[PDB]
C-alpha cells in the first residue's frame, strides 16, 4: 500500500541520517570505503562478506533494508570483521577493533535514542507479511 511505501520511505530516510553522522566521524574513517586490494590484498580472501558505510548507503538506496534490526546486522558485520581481521595485540590492530567497537555502540546509542520502537514494529510486520 501506499502508507507502506510512506513506511519504507522514512526507514531509508532514518538510516541514510544515521549512516551519515558515522561517515563524518573521524574515527570511523577506516570503515567509509571498501578496503583497497593493492594495500590488502588478503583482505578479499579472510573476510568473506566485506562492508562499509558506502556500501551501507548502497543497500539503504537499493530498497536492502525493510527494517532497522536488518540495517543493524550490517553495522555489527563492519564490526565483527574488523575483529575477525585485525585480532593482535598490535596497537594498529587494538585501534581498529576499539573504532570499530566504538561505530557499532554509536550506532546502537543513536538508534535506541531516536527510532521509535512502534516505527522499527511496523516495518518488521510490513516485512514479515511479504
Ligand atoms: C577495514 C580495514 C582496513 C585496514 C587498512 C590497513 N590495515 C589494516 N590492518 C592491518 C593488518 C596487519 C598489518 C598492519 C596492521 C593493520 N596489522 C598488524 C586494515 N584492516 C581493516 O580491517
Same mark, same amino acid.
Given at each position: 500500500?501506499?502508507?507502506?511505501? @510512506?513506511?519504507? #520511505?522514512?526507514?531509508?530516510?532514518?538510516?541514510?541520517?544515521?549512516?551519515?553522522?558515522?561517515?563524518?566521524?573521524?574515527?570511523?574513517?577506516?570503515?567509509?570505503?571498501?578496503? @583497497?586490494? @593493492?594495500?590488502?590484498?588478503?583482505?578479499?580472501?579472510?573476510?568473506?562478506?566485506?562492508?562499509?558505510?558506502?556500501?551501507?548507503?548502497?543497500?539503504?538506496?537499493?530498497?536492502?533494508?525493510?527494517?532497522?534490526?536488518?540495517?543493524? #546486522?550490517? +553495522?555489527? %558485520?563492519?564490526?565483527?570483521?574488523? %575483529?575477525?581481521?585485525?585480532?593482535?595485540?598490535?596497537?594498529?590492530?587494538?585501534? +581498529?577493533?576499539?573504532?570499530?567497537?566504538?561505530?557499532?555502540?554509536?550506532?546502537?546509542?543513536?538508534?535506541?535514542?531516536?527510532? @521509535?520502537?512502534?516505527?522499527?514494529?511496523?516495518?518488521?510486520? +510490513?516485512?514479515?507479511?511479504?
Amino acid at each position: 500500500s501506499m502508507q507502506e511505501e @510512506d513506511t519504507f #520511505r522514512e526507514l531509508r530516510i532514518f538510516l541514510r541520517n544515521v549512516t551519515h553522522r558515522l561517515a563524518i566521524d573521524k574515527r570511523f574513517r577506516v570503515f567509509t570505503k571498501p578496503v @583497497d586490494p @593493492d594495500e590488502v590484498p588478503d583482505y578479499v580472501t579472510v573476510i568473506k562478506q566485506p562492508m562499509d558505510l558506502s556500501s551501507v548507503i548502497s543497500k539503504i538506496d537499493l530498497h536492502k533494508y525493510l527494517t532497522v534490526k536488518d540495517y543493524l #546486522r550490517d +553495522i555489527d %558485520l563492519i564490526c565483527s570483521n574488523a %575483529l575477525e581481521y585485525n585480532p593482535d595485540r598490535d596497537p594498529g590492530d587494538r585501534l +581498529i577493533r576499539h573504532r570499530a567497537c566504538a561505530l557499532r555502540d554509536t550506532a546502537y546509542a543513536i538508534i535506541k535514542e531516536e527510532l @521509535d520502537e512502534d516505527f522499527e514494529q511496523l516495518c518488521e510486520e +510490513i516485512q514479515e507479511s511479504r
